[PDB]
Scaffold this active site. Structure first.
Site, PDB file in Angstrom:
ATOM      1  N   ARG A   1      -1.963   6.869  -0.213  1.00 45.27           N
ATOM      2  CA  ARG A   1      -1.311   6.152   0.886  1.00 45.27           C
ATOM      3  C   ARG A   1       0.181   6.127   0.669  1.00 45.27           C
ATOM      4  O   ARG A   1       0.939   6.178   1.619  1.00 45.27           O
ATOM      5  CB  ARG A   1      -1.791   4.707   0.966  1.00 45.27           C
ATOM      6  CG  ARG A   1      -3.289   4.607   1.223  1.00 45.27           C
ATOM      7  CD  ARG A   1      -3.735   3.187   1.091  1.00 45.27           C
ATOM      8  NE  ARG A   1      -3.974   2.845  -0.311  1.00 45.27           N
ATOM      9  CZ  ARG A   1      -4.269   1.606  -0.719  1.00 45.27           C
ATOM     10  NH1 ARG A   1      -4.328   0.597   0.163  1.00 45.27           N
ATOM     11  NH2 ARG A   1      -4.550   1.380  -2.012  1.00 45.27           N
TER      12      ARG A   1
ATOM     13  N   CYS B   1       0.776   3.139  -3.851  1.00 45.60           N
ATOM     14  CA  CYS B   1      -0.394   2.438  -3.442  1.00 45.60           C
ATOM     15  C   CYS B   1      -1.216   2.351  -4.701  1.00 45.60           C
ATOM     16  O   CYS B   1      -0.670   2.092  -5.720  1.00 45.60           O
ATOM     17  CB  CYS B   1      -1.109   3.199  -2.368  1.00 45.60           C
ATOM     18  SG  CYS B   1      -1.588   4.801  -2.856  1.00 45.60           S
TER      19      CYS B   1
END
Ligand SMILES: *SS[C@H]1NC=C(C[C@@H](C(=O)O)[N+](C)(C)C)N1
Ligand SMILES: [Br-]
Ligand SMILES: [Cl-]
Ligand SMILES: [Mg+2]
Ligand SMILES: [Zn+2]
Length: 426
Positions: free
Chosen positions: A386, A381
């Site tokens: 993430r 990410c």
């Protein structure tokens, strides 16, 4: 007064596309957790997860539709008992679903005979329920645990208040800066890692239980990540797993799940208990971490893919995604796997209560873009938070070669030699 379906009729309907079988128990029971002492845990093969708990959520009906559960479908509900299904079946009938049955005999009849097909999240024991955590801290006997040494760790990013405002009794707090560098936003060096874990009271043979608290991340604010505590927790789990902590658990749904279960919370500032030796070379699992050279290799290789776990506005290059990232764009050749709304939310990988989204849905979405277990996959990410959550999900499914490309877009875009795309794709 609801129609009943027999064990035998249900078994003969397992391949029918017009039947939707719906497990109303907690997501953790769906996943594998043997919450009532059942010998075989998990779900009826091909069942979807719709926790009864979610009945109080205003968007209940949108969840259902988003799960592709339609009024024309024959809905068959089951739980630990037929009584837990009552309210769900009423609710279905109240919203125009006229074909609704309850299956009374999931446990013990379906669970306690091995002719009845069940499925489960392969590494479910790494994604733990609140009651398991309570058992653990209470000294009680619990499944999936044969260790004498544990530590509950509340993650946060420069926000001790996320811990001081209320935490799991006895847990200590770990700032994400203890394991990642604010210069690179990558994992720290082996020496630092060693020293930080020792000082947090963690050895390689400790069972570490990670969680964080969701505090409504606001993109306006200077440090929105300070409010995304359970993503941070999963990020730290990644790093610890790479380091070489052999048994790392993540509390499913974060602090939220602990309070929802009505367990008591503490506000003490619990001091650390140091240990002197981590007790293992760092990193023991280097394959979990991928760096930019390798990432580049993976992009021009059939065997491998980078998986982009950012928002759509970041992907098309409308926003950089964070306030310390200057360039907007994407890495050419990665497979998009839309995280959610922005850098501090994971809606596509989570339910409204922050628990992991039904793993079959994650699997099939991923499959639609060629994100499959026979590849070496590196999830990324912006800085790797993430990316970590996506990685952890794949890991929970038993995927044999999954990684996090740590540098992410922040590292990649920091070299102006590196190519990038922008705008709506072609
Ligand atoms: S994966 S892009 C972004 N999502 C949340 C983070 C953590 C990041 C932040 O708070 O913006 N820090 C802690 C600065 C790395 N990454
Ligand atoms: Br969060
Ligand atoms: Cl990207
Ligand atoms: Mg990073
Ligand atoms: Zn399944």
């Amino acid at each position: 007064d609801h129609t009943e379906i027999t064990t035998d009729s249900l078994l003969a309907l397992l391949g029918s596309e017009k039947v939707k079988i719906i497990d109303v128990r907690s997501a953790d029971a769906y996943n594998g957790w043997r919450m009532r002492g059942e010998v075989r845990g998990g779900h009826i093969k091909g069942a979807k997860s719709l926790p009864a708990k979610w009945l109080t959520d205003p968007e209940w009906l949108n969840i259902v539709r988003f799960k592709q559960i339609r009024p024309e479908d024959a809905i068959v509900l089951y739980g630990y008992t037929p009584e837990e299904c009552e309210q769900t079946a009423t609710r279905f009938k109240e919203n125009g679903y006229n074909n609704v049955s309850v299956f009374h005999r999931f446990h013990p009849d379906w669970t306690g005979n091995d002719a009845f097909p069940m499925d489960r999240l392969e590494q479910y024991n790494r994604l733990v329920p609140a009651e398991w955590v309570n058992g653990l801290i209470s000294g009680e006997e619990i499944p999936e645990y044969d260790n004498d040494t544990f530590i509950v760790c509340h993650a946060h990013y420069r926000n001790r208040d996320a811990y001081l405002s209320g935490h799991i009794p006895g847990a200590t707090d770990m700032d994400t800066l203890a394991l990642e560098s604010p210069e690179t936003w990558n994992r720290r060096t082996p020496e630092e890692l060693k020293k930080a874990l020792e000082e947090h009271g963690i050895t390689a043979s400790t069972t570490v239980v990670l969680y964080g608290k969701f505090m409504h991340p606001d993109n306006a604010d200077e440090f929105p990540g300070s409010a995304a505590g359970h993503i941070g927790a999963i990020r730290l789990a990644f790093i610890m797993m790479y380091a070489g902590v052999e048994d790392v658990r993540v509390l499913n749904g974060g602090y939220q799940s602990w309070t929802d279960a009505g367990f008591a919370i503490s506000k003490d500032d619990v001091p650390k208990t140091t240990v002197p030796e981590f007790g293992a070379p760092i990193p023991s699992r280097p394959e979990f971490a991928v760096d930019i050279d390798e990432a580049k290799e993976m992009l021009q290789s059939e065997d491998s893919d980078l998986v982009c776990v950012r928002s759509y506005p970041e992907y098309i290059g409308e926003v950089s995604g964070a306030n310390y990232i200057k360039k907007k764009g994407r890495i050419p050749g990665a497979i998009f796997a839309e995280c959610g709304s922005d850098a501090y939310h994971m809606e596509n990988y989570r339910n409204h209560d922050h628990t992991t989204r039904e793993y079959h849905e994650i699997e099939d979405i991923w499959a639609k873009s060629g994100i499959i277990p026979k590849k070496h996959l590196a999830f990324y990410c912006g800085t790797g938070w993430r990316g970590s959550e996506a990685w952890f999900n794949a890991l929970l499914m038993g995927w044999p070669r999954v990684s996090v490309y740590d540098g992410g877009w922040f590292e990649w875009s920091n070299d102006p030699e590196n190519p990038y795309e922008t705008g709506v794709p072609k």
